[PDB]
Design a protein around this ligand. Sequence first.
Ligand code: HEM
Ligand SMILES: CCC(=O)N[C@@H]1CCCc2c(-c3ccc(Cl)c(F)c3)cncc21
Length: 465
Amino acid sequence: TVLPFEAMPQHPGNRWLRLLQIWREQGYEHLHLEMHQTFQELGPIFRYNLGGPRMVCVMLPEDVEKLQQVDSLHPCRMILEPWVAYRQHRGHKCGVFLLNGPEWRFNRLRLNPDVLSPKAVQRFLPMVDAVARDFSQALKKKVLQNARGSLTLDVQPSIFHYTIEASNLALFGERLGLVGHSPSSASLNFLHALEVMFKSTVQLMFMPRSLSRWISPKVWKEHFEAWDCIFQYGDNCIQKIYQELAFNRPQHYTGIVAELLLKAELSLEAIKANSMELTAGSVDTTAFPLLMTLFELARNPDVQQILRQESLAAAASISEHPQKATTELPLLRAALKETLRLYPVGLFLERVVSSDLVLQNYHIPAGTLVQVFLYSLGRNAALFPRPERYNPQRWLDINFHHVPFGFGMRQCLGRRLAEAEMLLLLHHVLKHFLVETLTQEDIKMVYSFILRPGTSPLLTFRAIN
Ligand code: HEM
Ligand SMILES: CCC(=O)N[C@@H]1CCCc2c(-c3ccc(Cl)c(F)c3)cncc21
């Protein structure tokens, strides 16, 4: 028994007043909380009144399963008009994140062997380990200068400079010297450019180019100015590596981008495009869940202890061969799966379905936008018993339950790189320090394309020596 599409519960809010409030509020900060509240009132499935196109919202893994079967050769995501507009204007190609169809497949297949593949992970993992080591060592130096052998600080700036340092070394094979040193003007500008880029995305996301072009021209100006800065930073990296490789082909591994340039399977302008997305992509996406794991470990000392015991046992083997960290730290990997469950990076998994399907016994026609709301999915007390409870052990009992990086062929390209940056930092921090905090109040998240914390709590790093 299958019900028609219009039989599905509808969102009570209308598209026009929705447009008007973003113009008034300069963004959609609360979106995650608003959508979560809607699911509690209308059920695990509802249709959004987009006024013509079909838009469906889901929050169940059983829906994610069915959504993967309809993926096809070319899984299609909604076109992100503000980002694409910048590429067209400046004459740049689109990377694997913004592409669709056969153009996406060509790029993706030529990127997987050097960005995501296990053989590639074995090569960039020891590089990331060196950065992660330097972070803990630099921290230990400042901790031992205090009488109590502890340092209480806002970790957010330092963690952000780690994700910049670790990503640049993994991608380009260049140490920027940000870990253990004062932040560079160039890095601070890049971070702010990203901050502004995401802010302006939300404002321009919901309305057509036609409307936004005269209603919000200064939002458009602000968005492009932010991208001009992001692109300036990324192009500087690409110009350095291209000149270095033009004069000498190295025998040893010197980063992800180096491998892509040497293989030359993709055009320079496509390597430039994809490398830009990997450079800008890896900063905020890796740092925010790293910061949230640190907070949740500071909150749950009992959980921390188990993870510390695991990391101190596997310390000797990871010191000799860093690539072991993946296989020898199941609890820490499960702690990361837990952090991403409670605190997702984005909010929606998008799919513009290629053929008809049945979701929650409702008919879903072809060309329907299906959005998987990750914030709500992580909170279902039937699938994730005690959902408010930060318990990594839950992942070792168990399927489409864990899906923060997505699914199928379109599933996150940086997934393995992000995992390595997170694992290795936490491993070295747990080895030498005890994280603590008096802030036991949950941090309020802010929707600015990337679901980011509104507060950065004070964390005490106490040395074990
Ligand atoms: C650790 C947190 C991260 C999460 C949760 C995450 C999650 C996601 C999700 C859900 C997708 C799309 C999956 C889909 O639609 O099927 C995705 C795509 C992508 N991510 Fe991330 N990501 C993370 C880190 C990274 C990092 C560090 C980078 C930069 C290297 C990155 C680069 C990308 C790219 C290029 C894509 C596009 C994949 C494609 O269209 O083929 N991500 N990410
Ligand atoms: C629902 C999960 C999700 O999409 N998270 C976030 C959304 C914000 C951007 C993003 C990226 C990404 C960020 C910036 C650029 Cl330039 C890019 F090219 C890709 C990669 N990976 C995850 C995510």
